[PDB]
Design a protein around this ligand. Structure first.
Ligand SMILES: [Mg+2]
Length: 248
């Protein structure tokens, strides 16, 4: 009879998290991942956040951001329609946030909660990334929210960019991360090369690939306008510069 989130992650089992998830998500499936944590220091609060196995329908209105994360303050419900609690590109997250001090009434306290949540969720994505198979599932569902985050989040960009995934000349069937791309780059390669296009088919046989394939340089394939734009906002990854081959 004690709020699940107030319990230590160690004492909670799956199915307990699953049932609790069903209880708040209007979803029948178990969550893809569960991020239960607590924050201490200047501000104190607990939270259980979930990443759905699949992107919800959300085809009722024009907008979308209707984050139904239940907001509690010392175990007493307050609202499931909080504002600025979590970024718009992350609205797909479901769960509960229980704060010790009143989120008040913009408010400052709310901002530090939002900051910790973003930090924890990136932490959850890198975790899902440990299983390239379960990560594909997550990418198929929220690759759009990730790209959106890389575009909206300048302070967490580099980190989020580590979540992008693309096909390449050396990554045909399976997708690859920009980190693995870097690792694969030969000693004399200084740039991360890529090419933009309407589709994979249209980009796979570009004559611009010849000057690279012959020098055994891997090249990424971007087919989404958001990925393209994102790359100009990223510029560099891990130190390497992003270069569009079609240009030069
Ligand atoms: Mg089950």
């Amino acid at each position: 009879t004690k709020p699940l989130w107030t319990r230590n992650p160690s004492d909670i089992t799956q199915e307990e998290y699953n049932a609790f998830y069903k209880s708040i998500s209007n979803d029948w499936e178990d969550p893809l991942y569960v991020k239960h944590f607590s924050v201490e220091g200047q501000l104190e609060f607990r939270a259980i956040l979930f990443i759905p196995k699949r992107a919800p329908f959300d085809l009722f209105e024009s907008k979308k951001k209707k984050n139904n994360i239940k907001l509690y303050v010392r175990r007493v419900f307050i609202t499931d329609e909080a504002e600025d609690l979590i970024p718009e590109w992350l609205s797909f997250v479901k769960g509960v946030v229980d704060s010790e001090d009143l989120p008040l009434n913009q408010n400052k306290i709310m901002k530090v909660i939002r900051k910790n949540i973003v930090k924890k969720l990136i932490e959850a994505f890198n975790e899902i990334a440990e299983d390239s198979e379960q990560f594909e599932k997550f990418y198929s569902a929220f690759s759009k929210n990730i790209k959106l985050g890389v575009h909206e989040d300048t302070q967490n960009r580099a980190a989020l960019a580590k979540l992008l995934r693309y096909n390449s000349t050396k990554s045909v069937d399976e997708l690859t991360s920009l980190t693995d791309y870097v690792t694969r780059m030969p000693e004399h390669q200084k740039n991360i090369y890529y090419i933009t296009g309407e589709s994979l088919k249209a980009v796979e046989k570009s004559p611009f690939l010849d000057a690279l394939k012959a020098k055994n340089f891997e090249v990424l394939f971007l087919t989404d306008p958001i990925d393209e734009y994102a790359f100009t906002q990223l510029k560099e990854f891990e130190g390497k510069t992003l270069v569009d081959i079609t240009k030069d």
